[PDB]
Amino acid sequence: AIRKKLVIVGDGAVGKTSLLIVFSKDQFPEVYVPTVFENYVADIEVDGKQVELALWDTAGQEDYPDTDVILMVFSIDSPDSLENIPEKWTPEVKHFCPNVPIILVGNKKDLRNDEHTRRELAKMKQEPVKPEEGRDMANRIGAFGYMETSAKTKDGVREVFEMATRAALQA
Ligand SMILES: Nc1nc2c(ncn2[C@@H]2O[C@H](COP(=O)(O)OP(=O)(O)O)[C@@H](O)[C@H]2O)c(=O)[nH]1
Ligand SMILES: *[C@@H]1[C@@H](C(=O)OCC=C)c2ccccc2S1(=O)=O
Secondary structure, X not given: OOXXXXXXXXXXXXXXXXXXXXXXXXXXXXXXXXXXXXXXXEEEEEOOEEEEEEEEEOOOOOOOOOOOEEEEEEEOOOHHHHHHHHHHHHHHHHHHOOOOOEEEEEEOHXXXXXXXXXXXXXXXXXXXXXXXXHHHHHHHHOOOEEXXXXXXXXXXXXXXXXXXXXXXXXX
């Protein structure tokens, strides 16, 4: 139960790299945190077990070895990114990583009540994603869990990688 492979997917600019950075910076002893994550190994202890979590980021390859857990990310400031969860990312991962557990991640939750974000979205007849919309989507796609994060304030980040690790440990 030591080596587990995590892949993070979702629309461009939802914060996938930022989430990996925050998680990797949280490691102690401190290590150099890169800008690219491809089989990057981070150590984590969850519950009892020490785990080597190999991180794979798909930033730059959104428009195009067996994985243990998927972080599937949308952004709270982008209802478009949430709609791509059922229409694009879930079909893709279920074709290529069937039976791999999915954690649905709503990132940028620090923008839910941000006035600038709300007015830009208003010009599109859109509003920030509501928490229950995230939970419904997670239910609809059969996700192992749903979490809201902010890579900016770091809230939720540690918890989502803990949840991802438990899912990888249970298969
Ligand atoms: N306000 C806010 N901005 C974020 C958050 N995560 C990422 N960002 C910003 O979103 C932009 C894209 O982030 P990035 O990690 O590169 O997204 P990626 O394309 O999915 O890998 C950056 O300029 C961030 O700094 C967040 O939780 N809150
Ligand atoms: C499954 C996973 C995969 O196929 O393993 C290969 C790792 C490079 C993967 C990889 C990249 C993007 C998506 C996915 S997946 O969740 O469909």
